[PDB]
Amino acid sequence: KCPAVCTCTKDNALCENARSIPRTVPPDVISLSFVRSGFTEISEGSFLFTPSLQLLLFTSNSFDVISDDAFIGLPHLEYLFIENNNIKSISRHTFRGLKSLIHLSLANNNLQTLPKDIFKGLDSLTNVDLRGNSFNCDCKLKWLVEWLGHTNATVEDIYCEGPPEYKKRKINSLSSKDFDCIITEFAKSQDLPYQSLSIDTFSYLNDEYVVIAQPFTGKCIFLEWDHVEKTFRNYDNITGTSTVVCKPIVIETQLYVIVAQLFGGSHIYKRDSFANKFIKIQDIEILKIRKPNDIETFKIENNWYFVVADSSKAGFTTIYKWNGNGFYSHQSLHAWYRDTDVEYLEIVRTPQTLRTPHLILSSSSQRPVIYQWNKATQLFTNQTDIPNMEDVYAVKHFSVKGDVYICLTRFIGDSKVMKWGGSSFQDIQRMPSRGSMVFQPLQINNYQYAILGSDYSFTQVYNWDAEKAKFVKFQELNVQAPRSFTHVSINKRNFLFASSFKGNTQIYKHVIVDLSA
Amino acid sequence: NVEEETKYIELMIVNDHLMFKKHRLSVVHTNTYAKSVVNMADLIYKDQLKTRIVLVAMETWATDNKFAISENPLITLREFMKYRRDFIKEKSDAVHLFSGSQFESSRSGAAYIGGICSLLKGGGVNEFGKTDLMAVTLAQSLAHNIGIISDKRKLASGECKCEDTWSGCIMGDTGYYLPKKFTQCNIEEYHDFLNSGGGACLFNKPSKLLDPPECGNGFIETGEECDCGTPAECVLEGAECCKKCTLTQDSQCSDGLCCKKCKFQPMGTVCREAVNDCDIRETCSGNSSQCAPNIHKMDGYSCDGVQGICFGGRCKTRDRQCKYIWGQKVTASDKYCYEKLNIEGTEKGNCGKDKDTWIQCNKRDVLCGYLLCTNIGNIPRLGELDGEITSTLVVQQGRTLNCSGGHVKLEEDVDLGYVEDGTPCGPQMMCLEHRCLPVASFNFSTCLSSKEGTICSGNGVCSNELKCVCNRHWIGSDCNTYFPHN
């Protein structure tokens, strides 16, 4: 009652050059072996009808895949040796179905991979031998490190044969360090029909809205998260010809919106509590403010202020204090200069341990200048320029732990990040950029990125390295012309908006992935 | 037609020491940079104003600043024109300063309005900037020199409009986004400036660039006997003649007003008629394809009858001054207005101010005083009104005449509403410093003459170069020699 392809004594069977697994064995057969059989793959759900086997071994075979639940039907199986073969990948649940397995050897078949928790489901295991395999060491072998540490079973040492950086290194000796299985990416969620310039967001009644300024047709666009089966939808527009910067402001549960244009640009709106219609409140004088290229919103000591950047030499930079009814002129800065950009940053100026509000505005042909706030006179007194950089278009800021750093934008040149010390800014990193109209730091869930755009070549995204303390190249984003990058947070959802001056603007989705699963 | 010709601006740029330092302490870098600025400005003018800007010379001072620079662009303009007059001998239609210092002004630069072809008034000053920004600055300065103005009753009223909403126009305020184009009203202001006789020196085409020659650029340079605008646009004129920037044997001329089908037009054929009483019409010489250098009557000739006297080919009268300052609908007041208003010595009329006091006009100075016009608008065509308007009603034998005037400011020392220098107050008389003086006090030059007490022996007209243009049947520098047949 034994197959002709096998050499079988009373309690043993030895099969060589078998094409298919026989399902019929004598009742008294305990151990069964297959040597150099012509098997393509293991039979799916194989080895039924033969519960009596306490031992199974395979040697010198060729197996492309070992199917799930292949060993089911062997409640008495104890020793299983699969070794000295060539196998690419095996399924995770293959070993499931035997709780009686004690000794298991995968050794010497040159496995480069194992699936996560391949050994789950056998609690009876005593010895396991993985030896003699070339193991490419990555998150799979990270779970394998977890299991090597956590198993009571004795396991002889195995070594990483790859990547070449790690060679002849004990898999038992590896820690969490020098493994990142957690990676982030930006994939575009949505494309929009219109070209964009500036973007900003605000929060009202748990709903998040986003403001886009479309320069050419003069549309200031308000869009909201639709929350039914839609990524984004625009619920409103504000029509102003030659609109440049749209910055919303909310003071005491009341929404105000400032728009800036080339002709009759100075304006300030308000949204009526009913009907959701924006109504113009104030018009600032056309004579004093001409061709503003920027707007920034900042609040200092229980008072909301407002600031505009005047790119014309005739107009002057103007800061606006807000009383109950509306905005009115507070201060003026940088007479007879062309001001490209303005930025508000709170830094610690020594000896003081307090954070003092500062202003950084950039000119066309001039170096950037920094202003120190004076509480007594309600003005900015110290005027200092940051040395050894010229033609800075814009300056942004970010804070990593206690330190505060700034990103300075240059169209053609080296855009560089600088550290704030006790007195002045200190050089950190010089990053060359071709045709960059923006350098944007962004902080999303303890991840500080930097986005450097190009109207010419790919937009270079950078990521912060805590150990290196220097930005590292991260991802490349294609934008026809990027004048801005904005971080938008929905509930448990993260997006970034990228304007395009010469093309359609882009909406990217922020996805965090874990390779360890 | 004077509008259809493509004119040429001979330009000399002077880079001060701060500009020289701003590039690499370097002559080649400053030269290439300035040449690029002129290149972009020339790209603007070629399309827009039908005028080419060619730079015939450049001088940069590496040694030291010659004069004292000011933060005020107007002062820097005056001093720079003092330097050109007292020092530079170079021949050019305009001379502009590129300054590395930053002025404190609403304006990025300053240039004299309608000052082209003038020695004293003939150029401007432009502060430092980027390539395109300084190209715009040079564009608006040369716009001032060429007669273009930013502001007007048409523009303030909205009749004149810059049709680019995203970017401005050259004469407007310049932001980060730089204007590529002139308003049509600026074009028509240029055409009005040309139709008044101004800018005669702009019709000469330079045959020498300061830069190595190039074929197909639109200019004839050493090594090429012909050229046209582009090999593509050459098909309109010059294609039958010019090949590889060289003429075949049967072609005398490539293209021009004096060139018809690769042949010189006969000498004496008129390329350009005279645009006004101050202009002399020019005829083809039979030598060159381009019409002869533009010439007008010498200063001191009468125009518009005895009501005016020519300066730079342009006729200066009081009525033309009223229409120029206050707009075309305005007419000059009758002499009764001036005659009555000069004697009173009020705010409504006067001969001038010394310190905070009105000078009583002398009897013959009546017409040299405060300028009076009849129908006046609320706002001036150019500049801004100082004080308020002036209206005085005068009744003679039941006739009511409203005599109105105003003080219009361009520069602190220059006030419109005073009779312009060189305007005649009477026969053989002219206004200077609001006083009526004889012509002999101006020490005008003269041409050669045989018969004494005559200009070009009465047979010709004396030019602004002091060369006689003879009438029919007369030849010679004095136009004395007669012709073979009467």
Ligand SMILES: *[C@@H]1O[C@H](CO)[C@@H](O)[C@H](O)[C@H]1NC(C)=O
């Ligand atoms: C033995 O291994 C199992 C695996 O799950 C673990 O739960 C148990 O704590 C281990 N016993 C030890 C380490 O004594």
Ligand SMILES: *[C@@H]1O[C@H](CO)[C@@H](O)[C@H](O)[C@H]1NC(C)=O
């Ligand atoms: C806002 O403007 C965009 C651009 O034309 C348009 O597609 C959208 O329908 C507008 N929203 C309105 C009219 O509510």
Ligand SMILES: *[C@@H]1O[C@H](CO)[C@@H](O)[C@H](O)[C@H]1NC(C)=O
């Ligand atoms: C001005 O700059 C100096 C550094 O030179 C600094 O000590 C001071 O705090 C700044 N603020 C002033 C002077 O108001």
Ligand SMILES: *[C@@H]1O[C@H](CO)[C@@H](O)[C@H](O)[C@H]1NC(C)=O
């Ligand atoms: C034009 O050229 C001819 C000879 O080609 C010469 O006789 C004549 O004097 C020239 N005209 C001038 C120099 O005005």
Ligand SMILES: *[C@@H]1O[C@H](CO)[C@@H](O)[C@H](O)[C@H]1NC(C)=O
């Ligand atoms: C006075 O000037 C006004 C300006 O509008 C004009 O309408 C009027 O005809 C003039 N003459 C008078 C009021 O006698």
Ligand SMILES: *[C@@H]1O[C@H](CO)[C@@H](O)[C@H](O)[C@H]1NC(C)=O
């Ligand atoms: C006449 O010529 C002299 C000589 O240069 C000059 O100084 C003067 O200004 C001229 N005009 C006069 C004397 O009115």
Ligand SMILES: [Ca+2]
């Ligand atoms: Ca900003």
Ligand SMILES: [Ca+2]
């Ligand atoms: Ca000339």
Ligand SMILES: [Ca+2]
């Ligand atoms: Ca040529």
Ligand SMILES: [Ca+2]
């Ligand atoms: Ca002429």
